[PDB]
Design a protein around this ligand. Sequence first.
Ligand SMILES: OC[C@H]1O[C@H](O[C@H]2[C@H](O)[C@@H](O)[C@@H](O[C@H]3[C@H](O)[C@@H](O)[C@@H](O[C@H]4[C@H](O)[C@@H](O)[C@@H](O)O[C@@H]4CO)O[C@@H]3CO)O[C@@H]2CO)[C@H](O)[C@@H](O)[C@@H]1O
Length: 370
Amino acid sequence: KIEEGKLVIWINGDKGYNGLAEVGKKFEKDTGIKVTVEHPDKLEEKFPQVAATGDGPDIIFWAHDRFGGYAQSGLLAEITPDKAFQDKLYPFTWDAVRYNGKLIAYPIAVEALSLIYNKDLLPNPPKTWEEIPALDKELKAKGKSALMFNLQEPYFTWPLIAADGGYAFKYENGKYDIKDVGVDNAGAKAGLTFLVDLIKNKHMNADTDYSIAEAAFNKGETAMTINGPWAWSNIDTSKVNYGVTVLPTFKGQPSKPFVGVLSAGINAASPNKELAKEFLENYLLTDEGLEAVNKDKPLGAVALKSYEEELAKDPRIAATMENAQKGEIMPNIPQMSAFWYAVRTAVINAASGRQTVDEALKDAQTRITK
Ligand SMILES: OC[C@H]1O[C@H](O[C@H]2[C@H](O)[C@@H](O)[C@@H](O[C@H]3[C@H](O)[C@@H](O)[C@@H](O[C@H]4[C@H](O)[C@@H](O)[C@@H](O)O[C@@H]4CO)O[C@@H]3CO)O[C@@H]2CO)[C@H](O)[C@@H](O)[C@@H]1O
């Protein structure tokens, strides 16, 4: 089901697909081949399924953490750029899309969660997690709340779990040791207990998801939320007077978000590798290609140095870079998806009272290490 002569791109629904569509149109305008951009639900799970058949998109966008597993299944072409092109992007973004010494994708953007706050309702954001219960009780007196964020997805809670010492896989020599997993140590247990105490004492609800939290913030019902740059767009249309700052510390330690590098990989089963390379290197990864996407939903701190130089004056980009620096670049090993599924279950079970914190995280460590 090759087709040929066209490009099909999958990208997640939260990202600037309509912008990327613009960039596709221009490529189609001066090259003649059509580019259809789609955003299937559950594309990152679908990809290893369809592309296994020899079908699916020519180009697949997702954070880099999924890209080791795809590479291990031989689903991605090795990419090949001259030293000149490589010099156009930041080096650490290349490291993230290397699997077994090979490059498996092009880096586009560096993503890190920030604290987003309603300046009108809250001139100074808290410096610490510990001062959030008190802040909530003040605000509830006026029918507002302190903080709502998506609790269904472990990506949003990880920064608190990691803060006092939790980790995914220990980095040994050049390897991650997949048997040394830090989701059940004292640091992780401290962080998840805190969150669970926030819910027990009605400072937020176990059921809050991405939509609930986004609506509460953008209507001015909650003073704070935790999200990444793709969310800024929807806030601007609400005209809420917002700032974007460092995440609060916990026990004196910085919150530590897992940093994701938005990457684009070429399906090894594509009859269109050359057209794919062309589109990416010469259309998308230019100041003009990147701004068209950014205009639709912001990318974050972008991998292309020339555009980042223009973006870096923005205090939002500055905050994004400050949280990224306190955080850690995710592994891209195949075991990352196993990690995520276990942790997701642990958080949801702990937050809902189905399990104690200690039970939840012990299960997760057992599930991850086999
Ligand atoms: O089991 C039901 C759930 O399973 C599916 O979600 C899985 C994904 O398949 C895994 O890849 C992983 O997801 C990670 C993701 O790989 C990682 O990048 C990060 O995702 C960010 C993204 O970087 C960022 O750009 C923005 O889009 O937000 C994403 C988080 O929403 O974190 C994810 C973990 O939160 O793990 C999940 C299970 O957690 C399926 O897609 C789900 O819809 C389903 O709930």
